[PDB]
Design a protein around this ligand. Structure first.
Ligand code: A1IUE
Ligand code: A1IUE
Lengths: 200, 200
């Protein structure tokens, strides 16, 4: 048994598992299957730990998984995460979004701006206006209007009608559909569907 | 998109991932690659969470993974595990070993008895003789001789030369070799090795 060749085969298989789990995570996020999403995230994250060297395509895949994980935790309070990074989950999604190797097109800008405003609005929704102001300071005439909105607890100001949580989720889901189509043909899902259509 | 067929394809792929990760765990245990073992265990355990219904073969696979995990933790102190089960890792390996659907042959009996004596001896090795006596009481003329050994702190008594930790590890590794050969041809490892030999 050649240990080098066994390690190489384990790396090929981890690459296949990563693409399959990204695909599974994308569909669970699109479908709103929260429990399936957290189980798939736990699996993808553990599989990622077994990899030491990543290609450009694999890095893009792990950062898409990290970004969707932060978006899904957008309205959830995680004590240890807040003490370690000193920022909120949507602010962490914003850092990943602005650093992924991808085209900065119209959809990219729309998603970026929707996350920026929702990082403040989710704090107002939870009743933490002091935190809403701290988020605003870390991210940012337009600024003076946004600061007056937070200060007046004007959570339902018309500005948030265009820059809503539902609009942020819809734009991100449209991006997820492109990722889903690009990976729909990856080895593991393709072979698994072949077994299903033959059964039957 | 048929959601039922997608869920079915995800179940087929999880079955493939489980067999591959069991194979990887078996080799890491045989090779003494501790860090690779804990990374593979984390991956196998997360993948197992994504499964709700298991065949007889899949149950045998998850219990082999659980047993090797307890054997690997044999000399390690885990506070939360001790408070939850009120037993040591080798005693938990013994419960799994005696309940797996497998032939109770000569090798099975040898491994069983080696774990029983090592569950006491690892406590003596760590200097906890009160715990060695509590382990003895939960598991058990031969008994009176074993009780006198613990009581006299006779850790290097000739009885432990035949029933040693190294002999327990060797017998378990011989069993691991049978599991390794039975799964050497499973879909994921087989396809991954094909890619490696073609590259080279
Ligand atoms: C950077 C890490 C830390 O838990 N992270 C948020 C993460 N999230 C999802 C996946 Cl699949 C992998 N990693
Ligand atoms: C029963 C569980 C609890 O952590 N257990 C010891 C476990 N160990 C290994 C694997 Cl791969 C799955 N499960």
């Amino acid at each position: 048994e050649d240990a080098g060749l066994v390690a190489e085969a384990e790396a090929v298989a981890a690459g296949w598992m990563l693409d399959f789990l990204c695909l599974s995570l994308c569909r669970a996020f699109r479908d709103g299957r929260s429990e399936d999403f957290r189980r798939t995230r736990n699996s993808a994250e553990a599989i990622i730990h077994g990899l030491s060297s990543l290609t450009a395509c694999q890095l893009r895949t792990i950062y898409i998984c990290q970004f969707l994980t932060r978006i899904a935790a957008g309205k959830t309070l995680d004590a240890q995460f807040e003490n370690d990074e000193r920022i909120t989950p949507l602010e962490s999604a914003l850092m990943i979004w602005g650093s992924i190797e991808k085209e900065h097109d119209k959809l990219h800008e729309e998603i970026q701006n929707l996350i920026k405003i929702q990082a403040i609005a989710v704090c107002m929704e939870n009743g933490n206006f002091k935190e809403a102001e701290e988020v605003f300071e870390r991210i940012f005439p337009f600024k003076s209007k946004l600061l007056m909105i937070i200060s007046q607890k004007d959570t339902f100001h018309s500005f948030f009608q265009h820059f809503s949580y539902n609009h942020m989720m819809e734009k991100i889901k449209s991006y997820v559909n492109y990722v889903l189509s690009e990976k729909s043909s990856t080895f593991l899902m393709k072979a698994a569907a072949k077994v299903v259509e033959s059964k039957r």
